[PDB]
Amino acid sequence: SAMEDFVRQCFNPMIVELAEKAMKEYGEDPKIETNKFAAICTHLEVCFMYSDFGKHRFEIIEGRDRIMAWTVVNSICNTTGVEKPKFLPDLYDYKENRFIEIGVTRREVHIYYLEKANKIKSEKTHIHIFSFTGEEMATKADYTLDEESRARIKTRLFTIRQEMASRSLWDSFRQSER
Numbered sequence: 001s002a003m004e005d006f007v008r009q010c011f012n013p014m015i016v017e018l019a020e021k022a023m024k025e026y027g028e029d030p031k032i033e034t035n036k037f038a039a040i041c042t043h044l045e046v047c048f049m050y051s052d053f054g055k056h057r058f059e060i061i062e063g064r065d066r067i068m069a070w071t072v073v074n075s076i077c078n079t080t081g082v083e084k085p086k087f088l089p090d091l092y093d094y095k096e097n098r099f100i101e102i103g104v105t106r107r108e109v110h111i112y113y114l115e116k117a118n119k120i121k122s123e124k125t126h127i128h129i130f131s132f133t134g135e136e137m138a139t140k141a142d143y144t145l146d147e148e149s150r151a152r153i154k155t156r157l158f159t160i161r162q163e164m165a166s167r168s169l170w171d172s173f174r175q176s177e178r
């Protein structure tokens with residue numbers, strides 16, 4: 001199909017390998033679940049851009065194998081005393097000293113935000129939701145990043161959506177899930 005062709009066109013080889021490993025973990029196949037494959041790449045890329053926009057302000061938990069990722073979280077918790085989250089989060093902010101959960105949605109940002117908040121119900125983990133329409137939503141409206149960084153992210157997301165559209169993959173992608 002053209003969805004896996006596109007993923008391999010637009011996402012750098014590391015991100016693809018990581019999303020393919022993520023899929024192969026629970027038995028999902030990128031050549032069948034092509035929309036989940038695109039979503040995995042996209043969210044991986046946003047996480048990586050987020051941490052790259054920060055002396056390293058952000059520690060990236062997402063994309064690591066569960067063993068390594070928990071090791072990183074447990075370390076952060078012992079040295080900072082921060083509360084240990086129930087679900088492995090996406091980033092750690094050393095400036096604000098808080099974990100972050102990153103969401104990327106094809107739906108309304110507040111729908112997905114409520115979904116994530118209710119999922120985590122840990123007051124300590126910060127939530128930042130991005131859409132493919134240049135919208136964001138974030139705990140207490142603390143967007144963590146400066147305007148240019150969040151614009152770089154919004155732009156890339158919009159660009160993925162528009163590349164899917166030029167290839168006629170957008171309507172399938174947006175009706176698929178989050």
Ligand SMILES: O=C(O)c1[nH]c(-c2ccc(-c3nnn[nH]3)cc2C(F)(F)F)cc(=O)c1O
Nearest residue numbers: 036039040041043090102103104176177178
């Ligand atoms: O594993 C994580 O940590 C994680 N997993 C997801 C996620 C969950 C379900 C689907 C899906 N799509 N269609 N069926 N299921 C896709 C994703 C993806 F965004 F990673 F692609 C979102 C997070 O934000 C997150 O942090």
Ligand SMILES: [Mn+2]
Nearest residue numbers: 062088089090
């Ligand atoms: Mn995650």
Ligand SMILES: [Mn+2]
Nearest residue numbers: 090101102103
């Ligand atoms: Mn996430």
